[PDB]
């Protein structure tokens, strides 16, 4: 057990062992200063859960999607990504491609939401 | 390869947020309202960029210490009746030549609980608190600008450690590098739930009761080449300074209204002597030798390091102003910085005491510090300096200060607040069925 | 067997939390700011441990009632000009022997709207409000300690029922047992969203306008054997007490500043008579007979139960202090507790009225109750007692009080706040695919 | 219909049919008091939902898990647990072992989150 | 792309294309007033998500259920509901039948919770 | 067919919520606390029922503007020492006939920085601010109602546009119909992030600096047949009005206490002339012709439309009360409304200046507007009217006002707050597997 953010320097393969360690630490006039910080934490947490919900990833720490990895975002092979890089290095590389990926995940789920909805009526 | 979403990844971005208290008789910094304390996670292979001169932890602490200061002064006596005409004489009873003309014996007509009854009382006022109107007539210095709120005798000015703890979804990164200049990459990063006990010690020209450097004296400036920037020196070993007020003051309570009471100096019991601070000559000399030796690294080996005293300005910036024992001292510190360096005894610094305090450089909100019964002795640690350089082969360093953010910049230099970004997308061979 | 997670199980732990208002001319307890009311769920087979002496509903209600009291006194006239010298004479106009020397006619120089103009006014002050300085010179008792904030004439002191409602995730358990001593298991537990209308009736030595016991008189003490603990007696049938101030007061408004006005007693129209309270001699005797009968169960059948009056102390603890009609009464209640018990007529209790009120035992925060014009009559219910026992074959019980938490401990004894734990894990043959 | 907490005295089997009842009452100077109590109710609700999510139990009131019962936590059989005891009696018995099971549920889901993740890579 | 509430006047069939647009804007003197508006936004959002989880619709925008459509609620056929009316018109029609449908969905999922619990026991 | 749950449906309903400020030297309506602004989506086929006379945004704006007002008057000087006897003479130095006996040269004794010392000062007070008490003796208009705060010299009264933005889960529907009469279905609805910049312009009888109608003059009343309801006229073309205070007032600072200064009118440099406002006679006449044309659609083509001046009442309601330049004008609009309508030159409106201002119709809260140094000129836009109809073939319309919610009802008429209900259930051939 490494602790909160302990696997920050680990490789992304090894850092994915401990997603639940970081996940559980995101939730928990002077009274107002503390009180506004609590509300900010709650709504920041709920926006990330809402994003997972609209991608069909709610309640999952690791979620598989139906969006193929465009090589424009990163052309590096699978081996030099999960065994050589850390999550901090990776976030800086696809920072500009993050928003276009988020839209693709949202568009892939609502396509699946209806394709399952249509097939379920047969 | 397919996009897969990971939630809970160890990724953070630099962010600014509101940190809350933690703390392990009431104090000015209301730690009773602040939550109790409790946790050390080392981050291997993590290299983080720190910047003590653009750290929002310092600016938040400045607002918090200020707001805590003027919050304990709300339920305290406002000394509006004290702006009267003072018929002051010079205390010449058992005076020493150094203290000649510093204390004044001021009589005045004061209000009573009963509105229709007056009260002829007297008090010993320091020369720095009364200004003469042209026995002779005087008035308190704090009377054409504002009215002083008398410090409540039960609330204490003693700095107790406070911990600034990040809320949920935020982390505090701690530079564990022992040779950190306060800027650039930090090979040894660790995360804390929150910081060590940072005492809000209020002082100028000398960082008292602070944290010591681990191995060598650390000179931390925003940029050494710029003389307009202050230099934060940090000592590896402390230099103790012994503060004292030899006078045996008598606190005399004067009832100025229903409820409201005004505490005045009545008479000094015995001989009257000047307040002073003592620094060991040998301990100070070796410390300045260590300061110079790590200071030649930025100005060359052949340069001449000269220490001069404060240039000029207010008494708060030209003197080592501090507070311990309840009285506010203003020490000269001209024998401390008087030396030129080429490639049992003590230093006594004469100190002056004020009772009307404009503390956070604000104008229009003053405080009257009530007299302290007895004799005040005080032993502190000089754990750093705030030097200023002036624009040849010699460099002159004069003590600085005034801006109190530099005092807490020397404690929050190793700390950094980040925002956890737990949502990450990466490619894998896995596909959603 | 495999672990199965259930969310929403009916499990609770004991917890402390902030309950909010509910309430079905402004009042001191600002129920207008409190939310409106609306619900009874019986819990079969549930046996819960209650403890009225360690119930945090009492300590929260004490803080709220105090906080609502000094919140309605912020937008009210601060009577700082009232601390002057009072030249007082004795009101001897149509005076009775009992009221001889209790009312004083005090003249004083007062402010006007205009700062440069004075005002020679007079007012009838009770003997309990003015202290003599050594016609003769007096001053108000509330002048070497604080300044009274005059009670705003539009804000009412009448206690209106309030409901303390638990937030989400918390439940309030109500003990429906009719023979509950306030401690131990309660076979009949029910849950409520929140409590019945609990009127914050402030009184000492007698629980007025409270809740009655269902079947028999209930004696509830933290431990009977300890005499240092108060005894909370609760009546099954009420004893009505008729309060009156026979004097026909005149409210005279004295303008003491721009805005600010001070309401003073001007002249009483006609005969002067003492305030008093009437308790039926038969109704009180039968009630004390019932109190003794259930009080012998803790001290033996052969013991001698003696009722004596208050030992000594402040006027607030030695007298049945209460408030109704706007005036604050302080009744002797020595004829109520004067009897020894072995194994149309009324009792008149002489009451004294104060206008300067230190209500929550706080020192330095007083209130001036403005005079009530006319004649005040008041009918309330004695629904309990606050007795104290003293350390033979006889036991002496004297009325107690002072601590107002015992007044609201007699209303919140059956209530309890619990924290719902909806997450539970239990074994089942079912397995996740 | 029994109402909120009505099945507190009911047996564990009978009280588990009213989970929707207790679930929906966990969510709904002197202004901060109301406001800070509301924020605490939201934070507590989200912490229990987060626990269910990391156990694979998100969106479920009765959640089948893969953690076996050690019988060192409770030696009682199903007959005397689901037909004799109540949830209050049961909670007081496994209170010591609650955090032990809570860690096994989290550990089991993380291993299951990847055994399923590795299965989709074929 | 129409924008927030852009499909308000569109037919329900066309307005069901853009549920994500409205879903993502339900979550995110000028002090406590602004702070309590944020807490009210979180509480309303959390109570709607709690309802979906109780009906078995957590993490979904379109959730086909097992409750049959009682013809008393609306006798209209699918052609004139999903191609002739808007969501605002529909809400007016079944405003009074909303609560009885909500109870039907709540009890229907509660029956599936125990039905899948019993099937998994074999 | 089976029930299918849809989340995120575009459904709303009318709701009331606390909209938060947003805004694109301090100001009374603080923009520092208002969040920065950033937006509009057209809703085809959407017909929404608006009602400007039951809109809660107007009621929520009235509380916010008042609350924004008096919290900005908290930190600055309370002029309770200005309630004294004034020895007022008449200013006859270079006064015109119109403004004769309108300024008073009042001398009084002022408190000094020193409590015991006294200060003999003089100031120029308008006739509307002082009342005689029986050179003659006067006192300020509001010294028997309240002591009242000097308007803080550094805060600005200038209206700054503010955007009221709905929180999450709420939407603001904006009616884009150009001939909307404030009530009924609006065929052209759009949703905006929040409202346009609505300047909180305080005015009476004339809507200054407002929003203009798109096509024609809009007549808007809650019930056009009810004379007791005010009529809100909106102009399609603005009528500029030129305000002026010709006197060259000099602001004089009087030190009335420690840290408190009172700003008094020293002397006018030059001749004393009356303040006035100019409206073009041709522009006003053509605008009233447009107003009458749209006013005949509710009363007939043959009805005689008569404009008269204000019926009577307070100076704030009988005059075009407004503020610009820091001084509060009270202009006489009897020349604007004097005409009867049947089937280069300018209008000069004599104004009067007042310094004690009570503007939210609250007795007990006055504000002293300090004198403005120099000459004040002001150019505004008459963008509407607030008319009242008298209780025959002749209809008489008189200017109205007083109720300040009508001034902001003319800006928030096109806006509506709705609550999004995203949970919808509809039948489908779906069946959960
Ligand atoms: C730096 O820290 C030192 C100790 O860490 C501070 O010295 C301590 O100051 C406190 C507050 O004045 C002293 O407490 C007082 O002691 C006197 C003794 O008679 C007592 O009468 C008072 O009621 C109070 O308890 C404490 O004794 C003193 N300790 C020592 C060893 O001197 C010093 O003030 C700090 N310097 C700063 C904050 O500038
Ligand atoms: C116990 O409760 C009783 C009633 O439940 C209280 O008596 C009531 O007290 C109120 C407040 O003083 C009386 O209202 C007043 O009535 C007079 C009548 O002239 C009126 O002039 C006042 O404006 C006000 O409305 C009420 O009449 C009175 N009722 C009775 C039957 O006496 C009693 O004060 C309570 N005792 C406490 C709280 O100690
Ligand atoms: C209606 O709007 C007009 C303009 O939109 C307002 O006139 C403007 O008022 C401000 C504030 O009084 C003037 O600013 C001032 O200008 C003077 C002279 O330059 C300067 O000394 C002050 O420090 C301040 O900056 C501005 O010049 C003026 N603009 C004009 C007259 O064209 C008018 O006050 C508004 N009417 C209302 C709100 O009733
Ligand atoms: C306190 O006030 C008294 C008067 O209220 C002052 O006594 C006056 O002193 C002046 C000299 O400047 C004399 O001309 C007066 O005759 C005195 N008045 C008396 C004695 O009633 C006294 O000086 C004041 N005390 C202080 C310390 O200021
Ligand atoms: C600071 O140092 C000076 C000198 O070393 C101290 O002054 C001496 O004090 C002692 C005790 O009071 C006397 O016996 C000596 O005569 C003093 N010497 C001189 C030269 O004045 C002083 O007390 C010290 N102050 C401290 C330690 O607070
Ligand atoms: C109100 O004030 C006046 C004076 O301001 C008091 O009258 C004085 O009384 C004393 C007696 O103690 C006389 O020696 C003075 O000559 C009086 N001054 C006058 C009449 O101007 C009066 O006693 C005060 N009243 C009260 C009730 O305190
Ligand atoms: C300001 O104060 C002065 C002095 O107190 C006043 O002048 C005196 O007023 C009194 C009134 O009773 C006269 O009897 C005196 O003759 C005046 N002169 C002196 C030298 O005392 C002056 O009237 C006050 N002004 C105002 C506006 O109140
Ligand atoms: C740091 O890197 C080394 C070498 O790659 C690795 O063995 C170690 O586990 C890393 N530390 C952490 C905390 O992952
Ligand atoms: C009193 O001391 C002051 C300096 O504080 C001095 O100017 C003045 O001359 C002294 N008066 C004497 C010694 O009489
Ligand atoms: C501080 O040290 C780091 C590490 O070498 C360096 O990058 C940075 O420039 C230094 N800052 C200053 C002001 O010398
Ligand atoms: C006035 O009453 C007081 C008691 O309040 C008494 O002590 C005093 O003697 C009385 N004075 C008389 C009767 O003259
Ligand atoms: C109150 O009654 C309960 C129930 O028998 C008992 O357990 C408890 O000891 C009693 N408390 C006192 C103080 O007698
Ligand atoms: C209480 O227990 C009895 C007997 O076991 C049972 O029949 C009844 O349903 C229980 N009550 C509740 C509310 O569960
Ligand atoms: C509005 O209704 C018309 C009628 O057919 C339709 O064509 C159009 O698409 C609708 N607009 C929107 C935005 O749905
Ligand atoms: C359908 O609704 C009607 C009332 O609208 C009700 O009487 C009937 O029982 C319902 N049918 C079913 C199957 O629930
Ligand atoms: C000032 O002039 C007005 C009107 O001419 C008059 O009523 C008033 O009495 C005059 N006051 C003085 C002090 O001359
Ligand atoms: C406003 O317009 C609506 C719809 O045309 C109409 O019903 C209402 O009477 C009008 N109001 C007035 C005051 O004319
Ligand atoms: C306003 O002016 C008109 C015409 O000049 C006049 O009749 C009226 O009296 C004036 N208003 C006041 C309050 O004098």
**Minimal CA–CA distance to B129: which of B66, B162, B86?**
B86
List residues bridging with F382 in a β-sheet: F208, F239
Determine, for residues D7 and C10 on separate chains, whether the beta-carbon distance falls below 8 Å: yes
Range of the domain at E36: 6-120
**Minimal CA–CA distance to B403: which of B259, B204, B246?**
B204
Ligand 3 close to Cβ of residue F379 (< 6 A): yes
3-class DSSP assignment, residue A46:
helix
**Residue keyed to tokens 């058992």:** B94
Q: How many residues does chain A have?
A: 122
Determine the Cα–Cα distance for residues A57 and B425; give it in Å rounded to an integer: 12
Determine the Cα–Cα distance for residues C231 and A69; give it in Å rounded to an integer: 77
| Cβ–Cβ under 8 Å, residues F339 and F307 | yes
Determine the Cα–Cα distance for residues C296 and C290; give it in Å rounded to an integer: 10
For chain D, breaks with the C atom over 2.5 A from the next N come after: 28
Determine, for residues A57 and B426 on separate chains, whether the beta-carbon distance falls below 8 Å: no
For chain A, breaks with the C atom over 2.5 A from the next N come after: 28
What is the β-pairing status of strands F2-7 and C40-42? Answer: unpaired
Determine the Cα–Cα distance for residues D39 and E45; give it in Å rounded to an integer: 14
Chain C interface includes E39 (CB < 8 A): no
Q: Measure Cα distances from B217 to B182, B232, B288, B385, D108 in Å.
A: 13, 10, 10, 11, 52
Count of structural domains, chain D: 1
Chain D interface includes C185 (CB < 8 A): no
Q: How many residues does chain C have?
A: 433
**Minimal CA–CA distance to E7: which of E98, E74, E82?**
E82
| Cβ–Cβ under 8 Å, residues E10 and E22 | no
Determine the Cα–Cα distance for residues B97 and C162; give it in Å rounded to an integer: 71
Q: Do chains D and F touch (3 or more CB pairs under 8 A)?
A: no
Q: How many CB atoms lie within 10 A of CB A116?
A: 15
Determine the Cα–Cα distance for residues C357 and C107; give it in Å rounded to an integer: 21
Q: How many CB atoms lie within 10 A of CB B269?
A: 12
SS (H, E, C) chain F: CEEEEEECCCCEEECCCCCEEEECCCECCCCCCCEECCCEEEECCCCEEEECCCCHHHHHHHHHHHHHHHHCCCCCCECHHHCCCEEEEECCCCECCCCCCCEEEEEEEEECCCCCCEEEEEEEEECCCEEECCCEEEEECCCCCCCCEECCCCCECCCCCEEEECCCCEEEEEECCCCCCCEEEECCEEEECECCCECCCCECCEEECCCCCCCCCEEEECCCCCCCCCEEEEEEEEEEEEEEEEEEECEEEEEEECCEEEEEECCCCCCECCCEEEEEHHHHHHHHHHHHHHHCCCCCCCCEEEECCCCCCCHHHHCEEEECCCCEEEECHHHCCCEEECCCCEEEEEEEEECEECCCCCCCCCEECCCCCEEEEEEEEEEEEEEEECCCCEEEEEECCCCCHHHHHCCCCCEEEEEECCEEEEEECCCCC
B407 sits in which H/E element: helix B405-409
A112 CB-contact burial (10 Å; exposed 0-12 / middle 13-18 / buried 19+): middle
Q: Which of A65, A78, A91 sits opposite B5 (nearest CB)?
A: A65
Chain D interface includes E115 (CB < 8 A): no
What is the β-pairing status of strands F328-331 and F339-341? Answer: unpaired
Question: What crossing angle do the helices spanning E32-54 and E98-120 adopt, rounded to 10°?
Answer: 60
| Cβ–Cβ under 8 Å, residues B244 and B211 | no
Determine, for residues D64 and C169 on separate chains, whether the beta-carbon distance falls below 8 Å: no
Determine the Cα–Cα distance for residues C49 and F127; give it in Å rounded to an integer: 75
Determine the Cα–Cα distance for residues F69 and F74; give it in Å rounded to an integer: 9
In a domain, D45, yes or no: yes
Determine the Cα–Cα distance for residues C249 and C270; give it in Å rounded to an integer: 10
Query: Which of B48, B181, B294 maximizes ligand 10 atoms within 8 Å of its Cβ, making it the mutation to test the pocket?
Result: B181
F430 CB-contact burial (10 Å; exposed 0-12 / middle 13-18 / buried 19+): buried
D22 Cβ partners below 8 Å, 6+ apart?
C8, C9, C10, C420, C422, D4, D5
3-class DSSP assignment, residue B95:
coil
User: Which ligand 11 atom is nearest residue C127's CA?
Assistant: 5
3-class DSSP assignment, residue B363:
coil
Residues C404, C410, C415: CA angle, nearest 5 degrees? 120
- For D7, the token pair is 């099945």
3-class DSSP assignment, residue C394:
strand
Residues E42, E48, E53: CA angle, nearest 5 degrees? 120
Helices (H), B253-360: 281-295, 315-318
Closest residue CA from atom 12 of ligand 13: D10
Class of domain F2-74+156-420: mainly beta
List b or e across F200-236, with b for residues whose CB sees 16 or more CB atoms inside 10 angstroms: bbbbbbbbbebbebeeebbbbbbebeeeeebbbbbbe
Q: How many CB atoms lie within 10 A of CB C20?
A: 18
Ligand 10 close to Cβ of residue B53 (< 6 A): no
Ligand 10 close to Cβ of residue B177 (< 6 A): no
Determine, for residues F258 and B80 on separate chains, whether the beta-carbon distance falls below 8 Å: yes
- The residues spanned by each domain of chain C are 2-74+156-420
List residues bridging with C249 in a β-sheet: C374
B387 sits in which H/E element: strand B374-389
- For A103, the token pair is 């839209």
Dihedral angle sign, alpha carbons of residues C218, C219, C222, C224: negative
Q: Which of E36, E53, E117 sits opposite D59 (nearest CB)?
A: E53
Chain F hits for B83, CB-CB cut-off 8 Å, are 113-115, 258
Question: What crossing angle do the helices spanning D98-119 and D32-54 adopt, rounded to 10°?
Answer: 60
What is the β-pairing status of strands F12-14 and F86-90? Answer: unpaired
Distance in Å, CA F332 to ligand 18 centroid? 6
In a domain, A1, yes or no: no
Determine the Cα–Cα distance for residues F12 and E8; give it in Å rounded to an integer: 9
Q: Do chains A and F touch (3 or more CB pairs under 8 A)?
A: yes
Q: How many CB atoms lie within 10 A of CB D42?
A: 23
Mutate to test the interface with F, among C78, C119, C154, C259 (most CBs of F within 10 A): C259
| Cβ–Cβ under 8 Å, residues B174 and B414 | yes
- For C327, the token pair is 């005036």
Q: How many CA atoms lie within 13 A of C386 on its CB side?
A: 28
Interface of C with E in 331-350 (CB under 8 A): none
**Minimal CA–CA distance to C142: which of F34, B206, B114, F354?**
B114
Ligand 18 close to Cβ of residue F332 (< 6 A): yes
| Cβ–Cβ under 8 Å, residues F428 and E78 | yes
Rg of the Cα atoms in chain A: 18
In a domain, E1, yes or no: no
Chain F hits for B146, CB-CB cut-off 8 Å, are 258-259
| Cβ–Cβ under 8 Å, residues C417 and D80 | no
CA distance D28 to chain A (A): 17
Mutate to test the interface with B, among C81, C137, C143 (most CBs of B within 10 A): C143
What is the β-pairing status of strands F394-399 and F374-389? Answer: antiparallel
Determine, for residues A69 and B191 on separate chains, whether the beta-carbon distance falls below 8 Å: no
For chain B, the farthest-separated pair of C-alpha atoms sits apart, in whole angstroms, at 99
User: Which ligand 1 atom is nearest residue B380's CA?
Assistant: 1
Q: How many CB atoms lie within 10 A of CB C93?
A: 12
**Residue keyed to tokens 């995940």:** A105
Determine the Cα–Cα distance for residues A19 and A4; give it in Å rounded to an integer: 10
Determine the Cα–Cα distance for residues E33 and F19; give it in Å rounded to an integer: 8
Q: How many CB atoms lie within 10 A of CB B267?
A: 14
- For F253, the token pair is 């600072």
Determine the Cα–Cα distance for residues F68 and F49; give it in Å rounded to an integer: 31
CA distance A100 to chain D (A): 24
What is the β-pairing status of strands F374-389 and F231-249? Answer: antiparallel
Determine, for residues A106 and E20 on separate chains, whether the beta-carbon distance falls below 8 Å: yes
Determine, for residues D117 and B430 on separate chains, whether the beta-carbon distance falls below 8 Å: yes
List residues bridging with B348 in a β-sheet: B278
List b or e across C22-34, with b for residues whose CB sees 16 or more CB atoms inside 10 angstroms: bbeeebbbbbeeb
Determine, for residues F258 and B364 on separate chains, whether the beta-carbon distance falls below 8 Å: no
Q: Measure Cα distances from B115 to B121, B123, C79, C164, C257 in Å.
A: 16, 22, 11, 45, 15
- For C247, the token pair is 């004097």
Query: What DSSP assignment string belongs to chain D?
Result: ---TTGGGSSBHHHHTT-HHHHHTTS----SHHHHHHHHHHHHHHHHHHHHHHHTT-TT-SEEEEEEEP-SSS----SHHHHSS-BHHHHHHHSSTTHHHHHHHHHHHHHHHHHHHHHHTT-
């Amino acid at each position: 057990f490494l602790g909160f953010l302990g696997a920050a320097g680990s490789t992304m393969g090894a850092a994915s062992m401990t997603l639940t360690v970081q996940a559980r630490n995101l939730l928990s006039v002077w009274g107002i200063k503390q009180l506004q910080a609590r509300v900010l934490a709650v709504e920041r947490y709920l926006r990330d859960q809402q994003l997972l919900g609209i991608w069909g990833c709610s309640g999952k720490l690791i979620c598989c999607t139906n969006v193929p990895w465009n090589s424009s975002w990163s052309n590096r092979n699978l081996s030099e990504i999960w065994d050589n890089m850390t999550w901090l290095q990776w976030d800086k590389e696809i920072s500009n491609y993050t928003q276009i990926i988020y839209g693709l995940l949202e568009e892939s789920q609502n396509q699946q939401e209806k394709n399952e909805q249509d097939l379920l009526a047969l | 390869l397919w996009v897969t979403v990971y939630y809970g990844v160890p990724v953070w971005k630099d962010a600014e947020t509101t940190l809350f208290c933690a703390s392990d008789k009431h104090n000015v910094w209301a730690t009773h309202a602040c939550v109790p304390t409790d946790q050390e996670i080392h981050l291997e292979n993590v290299t983080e960029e720190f910047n003590m001169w653009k750290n929002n932890m310092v600016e938040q602490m400045h607002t918090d210490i200020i707001s805590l200061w003027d919050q304990s002064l709300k339920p305290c006596v406002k000394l509006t009746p004290l702006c009267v005409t003072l018929q002051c004489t010079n205390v010449t009873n058992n005076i020493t030549d150094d203290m000649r003309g510093e204390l004044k014996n001021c009589s005045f007509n004061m209000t009573t609980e009963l509105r229709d009854k007056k009260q002829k009382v007297y008090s010993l006022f320091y020369r720095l608190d009364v200004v003469q109107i042209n026995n002779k007539e005087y008035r308190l210095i704090n009377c054409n600008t504002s009215a002083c709120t008398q410090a409540c005798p039960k609330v204490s000015f003693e700095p107790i450690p406070i911990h600034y703890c990040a809320p949920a979804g935020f982390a505090i990164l701690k530079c564990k590098d022992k040779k950190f200049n306060g800027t650039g990459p930090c090979p040894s990063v660790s995360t804390v739930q929150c910081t060590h006990g940072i005492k809000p010690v209020v002082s100028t020209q000398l960082l008292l009761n602070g944290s010591l450097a681990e191995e060598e004296v650390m000179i931390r400036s925003e940029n050494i080449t710029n003389n307009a920037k202050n230099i934060l020196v940090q000592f590896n070993t402390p230099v103790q300074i012994n503060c004292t007020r030899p006078n045996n003051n008598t606190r005399k309570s004067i009832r100025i209204g229903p409820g409201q009471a005004f505490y005045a100096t009545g008479d000094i019991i015995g001989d009257i002597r000047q307040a002073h601070c003592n620094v060991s000559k040998a301990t100070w000399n070796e410390t300045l030798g260590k300061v110079v030796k790590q200071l030649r690294k930025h100005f060359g080996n052949n340069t001449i390091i000269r220490f001069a005293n404060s240039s000029g300005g207010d008494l708060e910036v030209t003197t080592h102003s501090f507070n311990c024992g309840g009285e506010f001292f203003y020490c000269n510190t001209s024998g401390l910085f008087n030396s030129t360096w080429i490639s049992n005894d003590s230093i006594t610094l004469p100190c002056r005491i004020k009772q009307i305090i404009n503390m956070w450089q604000r104008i229009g909100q003053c405080m009257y510090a009530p007299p302290i019964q007895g004799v005040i002795r005080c032993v502190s640690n000089i754990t750093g300096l705030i030097l200023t350089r002036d624009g040849s082969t010699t460099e002159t360093f004069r003590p600085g200060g005034g801006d109190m953010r530099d005092n807490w910049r020397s404690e929050l230099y190793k700390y950094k607040v980040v925002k956890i970004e737990p949502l990450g997308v990466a490619p894998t061979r896995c596909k959603r069925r």
